[PDB]
Design an enzyme around this catalytic site. Structure first.
Site, mmCIF file in Angstrom:
data_model
loop_
_atom_site.group_PDB
_atom_site.id
_atom_site.type_symbol
_atom_site.label_atom_id
_atom_site.label_comp_id
_atom_site.label_asym_id
_atom_site.label_seq_id
_atom_site.Cartn_x
_atom_site.Cartn_y
_atom_site.Cartn_z
ATOM 1 C CG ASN A 166 -0.281 0.614 2.445
ATOM 2 O OD1 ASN A 166 -0.337 1.823 2.671
ATOM 3 N ND2 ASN A 166 0.351 -0.237 3.245
ATOM 4 C CG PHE A 195 -0.167 9.528 6.905
ATOM 5 C CD1 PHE A 195 -0.348 8.244 7.426
ATOM 6 C CD2 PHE A 195 0.890 10.311 7.401
ATOM 7 C CE1 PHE A 195 0.540 7.724 8.376
ATOM 8 C CE2 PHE A 195 1.774 9.809 8.375
ATOM 9 C CZ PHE A 195 1.601 8.501 8.848
ATOM 10 C CG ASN A 254 3.293 4.478 1.871
ATOM 11 O OD1 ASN A 254 4.112 4.123 1.069
ATOM 12 N ND2 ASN A 254 2.525 3.652 2.500
ATOM 13 C CB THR A 255 4.481 10.659 4.899
ATOM 14 O OG1 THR A 255 4.679 12.067 5.058
ATOM 15 C CG2 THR A 255 4.959 9.994 6.157
ATOM 16 C CE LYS A 315 2.497 0.164 13.000
ATOM 17 N NZ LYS A 315 1.091 0.044 12.589
ATOM 18 C CG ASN A 343 4.221 1.227 9.537
ATOM 19 O OD1 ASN A 343 3.555 0.797 8.593
ATOM 20 N ND2 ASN A 343 3.981 2.407 10.103
ATOM 21 C CB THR A 344 4.252 -1.802 5.629
ATOM 22 O OG1 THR A 344 4.369 -0.388 5.463
ATOM 23 C CG2 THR A 344 2.803 -2.156 5.932
#
Ligand SMILES: Cc1cc2nc3c(=O)[nH]c(=O)nc-3n(C[C@H](O)[C@H](O)[C@H](O)COP(=O)(O)O)c2cc1C
Ligand SMILES: COc1ccc(Nc2ccc(Oc3ccccc3)cc2)c(C(=O)O)c1
Ligand SMILES: CCCCCCCCCC[N+](C)(C)[O-]
Ligand SMILES: O=C(O)c1cc(=O)[nH]c(=O)[nH]1
EC number: 1.3.5.2
Length: 367
Positions: free
Chosen positions: A116, A120, A188-189, A226, A255-256
């Site tokens: 993914n 966010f 992803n950020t 996390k 996390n991923t």
């Protein structure tokens, strides 16, 4: 339609659903159905064996829904009905934001994995705050009854002050949460995981903890960090040091991953994003193991990454997790996977001579 039953969901219902709907559409539908309570019967009765006391709370069972499934706090009650011992919502960003353009979620069926890059997508603090406030007293009773609520905090893509983003989250959603998660670990950020190195992490978490400490006692949540599965040994040492220095209440691990382990078969393996599910599992477990040892077993860990069975859950527990979460397993196996994990975990605990979950926490380290 929905009766109702691990095998039917795994072999028939879910494969059919996934053939009809792309992952994000399926996600939206799952959230809608869950929020309405349109779920198969959670037959499994939680035993005393599964009860865990940690983070200043009782958890009826150690199996939670990971952040990202209910990003906006829309399905919390339905998630408890599914049999989760705790619910984490988020990540929530201060201001609303749309996230990345679609498609932004990809299935890797052959790998029992997902990639993914949501980025966010968030309704924002204000919307989530009012949503949680509408059921605040209901949550207080659920928490009392051993069903706590976590809130995972993010930052906006365009924010100039990351620490202030998190501080806002603490002030706004902290009073509504049993625990807060400082998510410094999204793939992803841009920049985000750089919040994980030392002097800057110390600065960030000092600010977060000060904001938390300024909340009234009844509205004062535990604070957890996390972390990514992709940290260097140096990063991990640094995090453990800051965690102990500041008295951070716990860690969520992990996390991923932005890694693509050798052996991935899915056609979409090379999509940008965080990888979750089975190929993440042992990387997560090993990170739990490392973090537990670095913190001397004194810092509660929520273990997450590729849990889809009792064995997966117990491995993380024995490696040092007090609680576990799953997300990806639900996308493949549907709601019955929750009872499956719990049932298998209870059986394995007995088989391995553990009086309960608590007895198994960190057991590998005592071998
Ligand atoms: C679709 C998707 C969205 C996610 N969104 C978030 C997020 O918003 N915040 C967060 O901390 N973790 C998020 N996660 C990471 C999960 O919480 C979890 O750490 C990771 O997926 C590993 O667990 P799993 O293998 O059981 O899915 C997301 C994961 C996926 C699959
Ligand atoms: C990326 O985030 C998601 C979230 C849920 C999913 N699927 C899903 C999860 C739970 C469901 O819940 C049910 C199942 C049967 C009856 C009622 C609800 C349904 C679909 C999927 C996917 O299909 O790839 C992806
Ligand atoms: C969410 C995709 C649709 C799957 C089928 C829905 C299952 C409905 C659950 C049946 N019931 C609510 C009565 O238990
Ligand atoms: O929103 C996302 O893209 C996201 C956030 C996060 O923390 N982890 C993840 O895999 N995706």
């Amino acid at each position: 339609m929905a009766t109702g039953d691990e095998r039917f969901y795994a072999e028939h219902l879910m494969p059919t659903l996934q053939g009809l709907l792309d992952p994000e559409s399926a996600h939206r539908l799952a959230v809608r159905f869950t929020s309405l309570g349109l779920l198969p019967r959670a037959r499994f009765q939680d035993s005393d064996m599964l009860e865990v006391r940690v983070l200043g709370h009782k958890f009826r069972n150690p199996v939670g829904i990971a952040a990202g499934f209910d990003k906006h706090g829309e399905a919390v009650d339905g998630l408890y009905k599914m049999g989760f011992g705790f619910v984490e919502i988020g990540s929530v960003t201060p201001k609303p934001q749309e996230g990345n353009p679609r498609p932004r979620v990809f299935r890797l069926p052959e790998d029992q994995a997902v990639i993914n890059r949501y980025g966010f997508n968030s309704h924002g603090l204000s919307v989530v705050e009012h949503r949680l406030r509408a059921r605040q007293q209901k949550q207080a009773k659920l928490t009392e009854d051993g069903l706590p609520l976590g809130v995972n905090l993010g930052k906006n893509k365009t924010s100039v002050d990351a620490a202030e983003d998190y501080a806002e989250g603490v002030r706004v959603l902290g009073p509504l949460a049993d625990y807060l998660v400082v998510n410094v670990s999204s793939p992803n950020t841009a920049g985000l995981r750089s919040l994980q190195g030392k002097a800057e992490l110390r600065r960030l978490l000092t600010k977060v903890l000060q904001e938390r400490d300024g909340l009234r006692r009844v509205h004062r949540p535990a604070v957890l960090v996390k972390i990514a599965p992709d940290l260097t040994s140096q990063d991990k040492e640094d995090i453990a040091s800051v965690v102990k220095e500041l008295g951070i209440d716990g860690l969520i691990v992990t996390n991923t991953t932005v890694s693509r382990p050798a052996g991935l078969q899915g056609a979409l393996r090379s999509e940008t994003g965080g990888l979750s599910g089975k190929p993440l599992r042992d990387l997560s477990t090993q990170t739990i193991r490392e973090m537990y040892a670095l913190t001397q077993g004194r810092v509660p860990i929520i273990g997450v990454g590729g849990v889809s069975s009792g064995q997966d859950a117990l491995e993380k527990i024995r490696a040092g997790a007090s609680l576990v979460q799953l997300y990806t397993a639900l996308t493949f196996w549907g709601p019955p996977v929750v009872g499956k994990v719990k049932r298998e975990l209870e059986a394995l605990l007995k088989e391995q001579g553990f009086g309960g979950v608590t007895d198994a926490i960190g057991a590998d380290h005592r071998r």
